[PDB]
Design an enzyme around this catalytic site. Structure first.
Site, PDB file in Angstrom:
ATOM      1  N   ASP B  25       0.776  -1.223   0.000  1.00  0.00           N
ATOM      2  CA  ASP B  25       0.000   0.000   0.000  1.00  0.00           C
ATOM      3  C   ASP B  25       0.821   1.294   0.000  1.00  0.00           C
ATOM      4  OD1 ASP B  25      -1.936   1.977   0.735  1.00  0.00           O
ATOM      5  OD2 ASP B  25      -2.705   0.843   2.445  1.00  0.00           O
ATOM      6  N   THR B  26       0.951   1.901  -1.197  1.00  0.00           N
ATOM      7  CA  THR B  26       1.693   3.162  -1.367  1.00  0.00           C
ATOM      8  C   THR B  26       1.025   4.347  -0.657  1.00  0.00           C
ATOM      9  OG1 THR B  26       0.709   3.642  -3.537  1.00  0.00           O
ATOM     10  CG2 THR B  26       2.841   2.424  -3.510  1.00  0.00           C
ATOM     11  N   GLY B  27      -0.276   4.235  -0.369  1.00  0.00           N
ATOM     12  CA  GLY B  27      -0.999   5.312   0.304  1.00  0.00           C
ATOM     13  C   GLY B  27      -0.841   5.301   1.813  1.00  0.00           C
TER      14      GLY B  27
HETATM   15  O1  LIG Z   1      -9.806  -0.587  -1.168  1.00  0.00           O
HETATM   16  C1  LIG Z   1     -10.291  -0.453  -0.056  1.00  0.00           C
HETATM   17  C2  LIG Z   1     -10.630  -1.649   0.812  1.00  0.00           C
HETATM   18  C3  LIG Z   1      -9.342  -2.330   1.313  1.00  0.00           C
HETATM   19  C4  LIG Z   1      -8.739  -1.618   2.515  1.00  0.00           C
HETATM   20  C5  LIG Z   1      -7.411  -1.204   2.488  1.00  0.00           C
HETATM   21  C6  LIG Z   1      -6.807  -0.657   3.607  1.00  0.00           C
HETATM   22  C7  LIG Z   1      -7.552  -0.528   4.747  1.00  0.00           C
HETATM   23  F1  LIG Z   1      -6.963  -0.003   5.846  1.00  0.00           F
HETATM   24  C8  LIG Z   1      -8.873  -0.904   4.823  1.00  0.00           C
HETATM   25  C9  LIG Z   1      -9.463  -1.443   3.694  1.00  0.00           C
HETATM   26  C10 LIG Z   1      -9.476  -3.825   1.575  1.00  0.00           C
HETATM   27  C11 LIG Z   1     -10.547  -4.340   2.306  1.00  0.00           C
HETATM   28  C12 LIG Z   1     -10.587  -5.675   2.677  1.00  0.00           C
HETATM   29  C13 LIG Z   1      -9.550  -6.485   2.292  1.00  0.00           C
HETATM   30  F2  LIG Z   1      -9.556  -7.784   2.695  1.00  0.00           F
HETATM   31  C14 LIG Z   1      -8.491  -6.034   1.540  1.00  0.00           C
HETATM   32  C15 LIG Z   1      -8.463  -4.693   1.186  1.00  0.00           C
HETATM   33  N1  LIG Z   1     -10.455   0.747   0.516  1.00  0.00           N
HETATM   34  C16 LIG Z   1     -10.728   1.979  -0.120  1.00  0.00           C
HETATM   35  C17 LIG Z   1     -11.436   2.087  -1.321  1.00  0.00           C
HETATM   36  C18 LIG Z   1     -11.385   3.266  -2.046  1.00  0.00           C
HETATM   37  C19 LIG Z   1     -10.627   4.334  -1.595  1.00  0.00           C
HETATM   38  C20 LIG Z   1      -9.930   4.198  -0.419  1.00  0.00           C
HETATM   39  F3  LIG Z   1      -9.147   5.225  -0.011  1.00  0.00           F
HETATM   40  C21 LIG Z   1      -9.942   3.057   0.363  1.00  0.00           C
HETATM   41  C22 LIG Z   1      -9.095   2.938   1.617  1.00  0.00           C
HETATM   42  C23 LIG Z   1      -7.610   2.729   1.308  1.00  0.00           C
HETATM   43  C24 LIG Z   1      -6.727   2.731   2.556  1.00  0.00           C
HETATM   44  C25 LIG Z   1      -5.382   2.059   2.318  1.00  0.00           C
HETATM   45  N2  LIG Z   1      -4.423   2.992   1.655  1.00  0.00           N
HETATM   46  C26 LIG Z   1      -4.238   4.249   2.432  1.00  0.00           C
HETATM   47  C27 LIG Z   1      -5.556   4.977   2.560  1.00  0.00           C
HETATM   48  N3  LIG Z   1      -6.560   4.079   3.174  1.00  0.00           N
HETATM   49  S1  LIG Z   1      -6.961   4.349   4.743  1.00  0.00           S
HETATM   50  O2  LIG Z   1      -7.890   3.328   5.112  1.00  0.00           O
HETATM   51  O3  LIG Z   1      -7.341   5.725   4.832  1.00  0.00           O
HETATM   52  C28 LIG Z   1      -5.498   4.127   5.702  1.00  0.00           C
HETATM   53  C29 LIG Z   1      -4.862   5.235   6.246  1.00  0.00           C
HETATM   54  C30 LIG Z   1      -3.707   5.052   6.996  1.00  0.00           C
HETATM   55  C31 LIG Z   1      -3.197   3.779   7.197  1.00  0.00           C
HETATM   56  C32 LIG Z   1      -3.840   2.682   6.648  1.00  0.00           C
HETATM   57  C33 LIG Z   1      -4.996   2.847   5.898  1.00  0.00           C
END
Ligand SMILES: O=C(CC(c1ccc(F)cc1)c1ccc(F)cc1)Nc1cccc(F)c1CC[C@H]1CNCCN1S(=O)(=O)c1ccccc1
Ligand SMILES: [Cl-]
Ligand SMILES: [Cl-]
Ligand SMILES: [Cl-]
Ligand SMILES: [Cl-]
Lengths: 99, 99
Positions: B25-27
């Site tokens: 996860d690059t984000g």
């Molecule tokens: O794709 C998804 C679902 C995905 C996921 C990824 C990470 C996560 F923490 C929670 C869910 C997933 C769900 C179930 C599974 F078994 C495998 C993957 N989510 C989604 C869809 C559209 C847009 C979007 F932004 C997101 C969230 C992306 C995440 C991960 N990259 C960083 C930004 N975020 S965050 O939750 O804000 C976050 C912030 C700081 C640290 C960690 C995660």
């Protein structure tokens, strides 16, 4: 280009004729942007993140440029911490992870 | 390798003698793993994003094997819905975004 990850992979996007900053996020299935006006009808969608699920507005076939690369696709609008470019659009611009 | 983003970039990782599936996860600035036992001292931390925040335990100098590549760094442990390999460890395996 080739982008390292020592800092956040923040890039300039153009949407609705306006330049904005967005994060290239391989961990996001979809693209989600902060509150803005987009054309057309929207559909309901729920997205899950680190802290739980949020409701967003789904707009389809939206024109968007990412680091100058043209894309047209689904853009979600909602309470996101930062503008996120997810896999739906990263695949459109031919973005890959390499190591 | 070259990983395309048609699907979630899930990889096998080795951490604290256990095999787990994790998302590249690059984000994400940090690496976050579901509840597990890790050696050494830890300190509390809050991490947030879509859906809000969660409380985690921060462990430092942890070795992780990602696709056969050894990397050392901080690992957060908590109630995450998916194991995430964040930028702090992606840089160590020489991971880059390319388009
Ligand atoms: O794709 C998804 C679902 C995905 C996921 C990824 C990470 C996560 F923490 C929670 C869910 C997933 C769900 C179930 C599974 F078994 C495998 C993957 N989510 C989604 C869809 C559209 C847009 C979007 F932004 C997101 C969230 C992306 C995440 C991960 N990259 C960083 C930004 N975020 S965050 O939750 O804000 C976050 C912030 C700081 C640290 C960690 C995660
Ligand atoms: Cl840019
Ligand atoms: Cl799309
Ligand atoms: Cl670290
Ligand atoms: Cl480097």
């Amino acid at each position: 280009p080739q982008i390292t990850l020592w800092k956040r992979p923040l890039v300039t996007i153009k949407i609705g004729g306006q330049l904005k900053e967005a994060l290239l996020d391989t961990g996001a299935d979809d693209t989600v942007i902060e509150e803005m006006s987009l054309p057309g009808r929207w559909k309901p969608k729920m997205i899950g993140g680190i802290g739980g699920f949020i409701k967003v507005r789904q707009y389809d076939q939206i024109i968007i440029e990412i680091c100058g690369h043209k894309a047209i696709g689904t853009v979600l609008v909602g309470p996101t911490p930062v503008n996120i470019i997810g896999r739906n659009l990263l695949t459109q611009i031919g973005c890959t992870l390499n190591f």
